[PDB]
Design an enzyme around this catalytic site. Structure first.
Site, PDB file in Angstrom:
ATOM      1  N   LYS A   1      57.311  47.670  77.860  1.00 14.41           N
ATOM      2  CA  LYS A   1      58.466  48.569  77.764  1.00 14.41           C
ATOM      3  C   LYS A   1      58.358  49.729  78.765  1.00 14.41           C
ATOM      4  O   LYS A   1      59.342  50.038  79.436  1.00 14.41           O
ATOM      5  CB  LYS A   1      58.656  49.082  76.319  1.00 14.41           C
ATOM      6  CG  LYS A   1      58.980  47.977  75.310  1.00 14.41           C
ATOM      7  CD  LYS A   1      59.303  48.518  73.922  1.00 14.41           C
ATOM      8  CE  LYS A   1      59.668  47.404  72.964  1.00 14.41           C
ATOM      9  NZ  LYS A   1      60.184  47.927  71.670  1.00 14.41           N
TER      10      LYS A   1
ATOM     11  N   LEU B   1      50.849  39.930  85.434  1.00 19.21           N
ATOM     12  CA  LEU B   1      50.302  39.370  84.193  1.00 19.21           C
ATOM     13  C   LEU B   1      51.255  39.561  83.022  1.00 19.21           C
ATOM     14  O   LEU B   1      51.180  38.824  82.039  1.00 19.21           O
ATOM     15  CB  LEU B   1      48.935  39.991  83.841  1.00 19.21           C
ATOM     16  CG  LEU B   1      47.818  39.873  84.871  1.00 19.21           C
ATOM     17  CD1 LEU B   1      46.615  40.653  84.437  1.00 19.21           C
ATOM     18  CD2 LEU B   1      47.418  38.443  85.081  1.00 19.21           C
ATOM     19  N   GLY B   2      52.104  40.572  83.125  1.00 19.10           N
ATOM     20  CA  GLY B   2      53.076  40.903  82.094  1.00 19.10           C
ATOM     21  C   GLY B   2      53.869  42.154  82.402  1.00 19.10           C
ATOM     22  O   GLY B   2      53.566  42.885  83.352  1.00 19.10           O
TER      23      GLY B   2
ATOM     24  N   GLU C   1      53.899  47.821  83.800  1.00 18.68           N
ATOM     25  CA  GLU C   1      53.822  46.537  84.504  1.00 18.68           C
ATOM     26  C   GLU C   1      52.334  46.302  84.746  1.00 18.68           C
ATOM     27  O   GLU C   1      51.640  47.201  85.241  1.00 18.68           O
ATOM     28  CB  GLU C   1      54.599  46.564  85.830  1.00 18.68           C
ATOM     29  CG  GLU C   1      56.106  46.468  85.645  1.00 18.68           C
ATOM     30  CD  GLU C   1      56.951  46.445  86.906  1.00 18.68           C
ATOM     31  OE1 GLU C   1      56.408  46.126  87.989  1.00 18.68           O
ATOM     32  OE2 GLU C   1      58.172  46.707  86.801  1.00 18.68           O
ATOM     33  N   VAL C   2      51.836  45.122  84.338  1.00 21.89           N
ATOM     34  CA  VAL C   2      50.423  44.756  84.412  1.00 21.89           C
ATOM     35  C   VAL C   2      50.191  43.697  85.519  1.00 21.89           C
ATOM     36  O   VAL C   2      50.902  42.701  85.594  1.00 21.89           O
ATOM     37  CB  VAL C   2      49.896  44.351  83.014  1.00 21.89           C
ATOM     38  CG1 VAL C   2      48.407  44.023  83.041  1.00 21.89           C
ATOM     39  CG2 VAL C   2      50.163  45.466  81.995  1.00 21.89           C
TER      40      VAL C   2
ATOM     41  N   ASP D   1      47.945  49.834  67.247  1.00 18.03           N
ATOM     42  CA  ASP D   1      48.683  48.694  67.820  1.00 18.03           C
ATOM     43  C   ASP D   1      47.817  47.443  67.866  1.00 18.03           C
ATOM     44  O   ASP D   1      47.870  46.673  68.825  1.00 18.03           O
ATOM     45  CB  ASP D   1      49.345  49.049  69.178  1.00 18.03           C
ATOM     46  CG  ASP D   1      50.518  48.143  69.566  1.00 18.03           C
ATOM     47  OD1 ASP D   1      51.090  47.475  68.661  1.00 18.03           O
ATOM     48  OD2 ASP D   1      50.797  48.025  70.768  1.00 18.03           O
TER      49      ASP D   1
ATOM     50  N   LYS E   1      47.395  48.533  85.687  1.00 19.45           N
ATOM     51  CA  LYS E   1      48.541  48.815  84.822  1.00 19.45           C
ATOM     52  C   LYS E   1      49.339  49.956  85.431  1.00 19.45           C
ATOM     53  O   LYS E   1      48.874  51.096  85.452  1.00 19.45           O
ATOM     54  CB  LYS E   1      48.047  49.172  83.401  1.00 19.45           C
ATOM     55  CG  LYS E   1      49.137  49.459  82.361  1.00 19.45           C
ATOM     56  CD  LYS E   1      48.424  49.949  81.121  1.00 19.45           C
ATOM     57  CE  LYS E   1      49.293  50.144  79.926  1.00 19.45           C
ATOM     58  NZ  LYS E   1      48.445  50.519  78.775  1.00 19.45           N
TER      59      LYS E   1
HETATM   60  N1  BR9 Z   1      46.002  40.859  80.530  1.00 16.86           N
HETATM   61  C1  BR9 Z   1      44.840  41.590  80.713  1.00 16.86           C
HETATM   62  C2  BR9 Z   1      44.834  42.980  80.520  1.00 16.86           C
HETATM   63  C3  BR9 Z   1      43.630  43.641  80.656  1.00 16.86           C
HETATM   64 BR1  BR9 Z   1      43.579  45.524  80.408  1.00 16.86          BR
HETATM   65  C4  BR9 Z   1      42.478  42.956  80.975  1.00 16.86           C
HETATM   66  N2  BR9 Z   1      42.471  41.628  81.167  1.00 16.86           N
HETATM   67  C5  BR9 Z   1      43.629  40.936  81.037  1.00 16.86           C
HETATM   68  N3  BR9 Z   1      43.583  39.614  81.191  1.00 16.86           N
END
Ligand code: BR9
Length: 328
Positions: free
Chosen positions: A50, A46-47, A53-54, A157, A69
């Site tokens: 720094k 998902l992303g 990693e998600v 943040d 995460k």
């Molecule tokens: N990108 C994301 C992070 C989280 Br924590 C929960 N849902 C998402 N879609």
């Protein structure tokens, strides 16, 4: 003049952590129990942050979607802090739910498991929002912030990327508590927090005794970008230039009043870049493309969030009582 900066404290929830046992806020003494990550199957990335990693994943035990995460363990004390805060806040309104804490058997990499949110990226969603939609979602973020502030925590943040919105279900979650911290009156904090465009003036002038009011400045930046369709609202190219972008709107007269009230020493790097700027009226930012999202109420609320003086900004509870929210 050699007295040093004038101390400051939050106007609300000042002593919430002082009156709680050390277990609550002493994250360095918190014992973390790590489950088996074999219960989760990773589906897609998902992303990439720094230090993380998600991933979107599936919990094999109940066939439900989750978010995993995977943390780069560069600072153990930082991992302990995020977990302790997430556990303290778990179940609160519009706060992302930490569902599990796990480690992959082979890598032993710390990972956090969260409830999944079916998000629409802000670069696609914000253009589709109506005047009502902005009022509604701003109120939802305010419920999360008044809650975590009441729990003695500042997010530090607040930005569009940390606000997950499932528009179809009108569900909002405030995520990424990795920079969050416990508020202790008189504590001097690291100013190198938040993302450049959302950093409060207190951070930019290196005023360490900040509080929950930092999140209210960040929220104001998000509001301004939404009602004016200008992303980001304050577009600095570095941390010093960021204050100049702010001064081109709020003016330099009120900035000098702020640093004089707290006896702040302005960094010599500001000497040749700050210049002199008049205070702009908020009505100057209204254009044909955004006028359907702007109102006298919206401008009065924005003016009450975007103030140099952190003590003069609305608290999340005062913000929830503003006329801008009478329709929600
Ligand atoms: N990108 C994301 C992070 C989280 Br924590 C929960 N849902 C998402 N879609």
């Amino acid at each position: 003049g050699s007295s040093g900066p004038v101390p400051s404290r939050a106007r609300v929830y000042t002593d919430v952590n002082t009156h709680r046992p050390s277990e609550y806020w002493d994250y360095e003494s918190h014992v973390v129990e790590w489950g088996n990550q074999d219960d989760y199957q990773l589906v897609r990335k998902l992303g990439r942050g720094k230090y993380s990693e998600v991933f979107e994943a599936i919990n094999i035990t109940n066939n439900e979607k989750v978010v995993v995460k995977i943390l780069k363990p560069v600072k153990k004390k930082k991992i302990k802090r995020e977990i302790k805060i997430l556990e303290n806040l778990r179940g609160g309104p519009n706060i992302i739910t930490l569902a599990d804490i796990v480690k992959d058997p082979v890598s032993r990499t710390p990972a956090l498991v969260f409830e999944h949110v079916n998000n629409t990226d802000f670069k696609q969603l914000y253009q589709t929002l109506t005047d009502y939609d902005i009022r509604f979602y701003m109120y939802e973020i305010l419920k999360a912030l008044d809650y975590c502030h009441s729990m003695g925590i500042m997010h530090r943040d607040v930005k569009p990327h940390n606000v997950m919105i499932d528009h179809e279900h009108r569900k909002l979650r405030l995520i990424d508590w990795g920079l969050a911290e416990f508020y202790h009156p008189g504590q001097e904090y690291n100013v190198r927090v938040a993302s450049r465009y959302f950093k409060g003036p207190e951070l930019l002038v290196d005023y360490q005794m900040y509080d929950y009011s930092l999140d209210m400045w960040s929220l104001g930046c998000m509001l301004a970008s939404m009602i004016f369709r200008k992303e980001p609202f304050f577009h600095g190219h570095d941390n010093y230039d960021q204050l100049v972008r702010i001064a081109k709107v709020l003016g330099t007269e009120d900035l000098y009043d702020y640093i004089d009230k707290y006896n702040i020493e302005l960094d010599p790097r500001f000497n040749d870049i700050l210049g002199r700027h008049s205070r702009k009226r908020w009505e100057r930012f209204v254009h044909s493309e955004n006028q359907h999202l702007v109102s006298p109420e919206a401008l009065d609320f924005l003016d009450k969030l975007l103030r140099y003086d952190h003590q003069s900004r609305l608290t999340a509870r005062e913000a929830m009582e503003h006329p801008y929210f009478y329709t929600v």
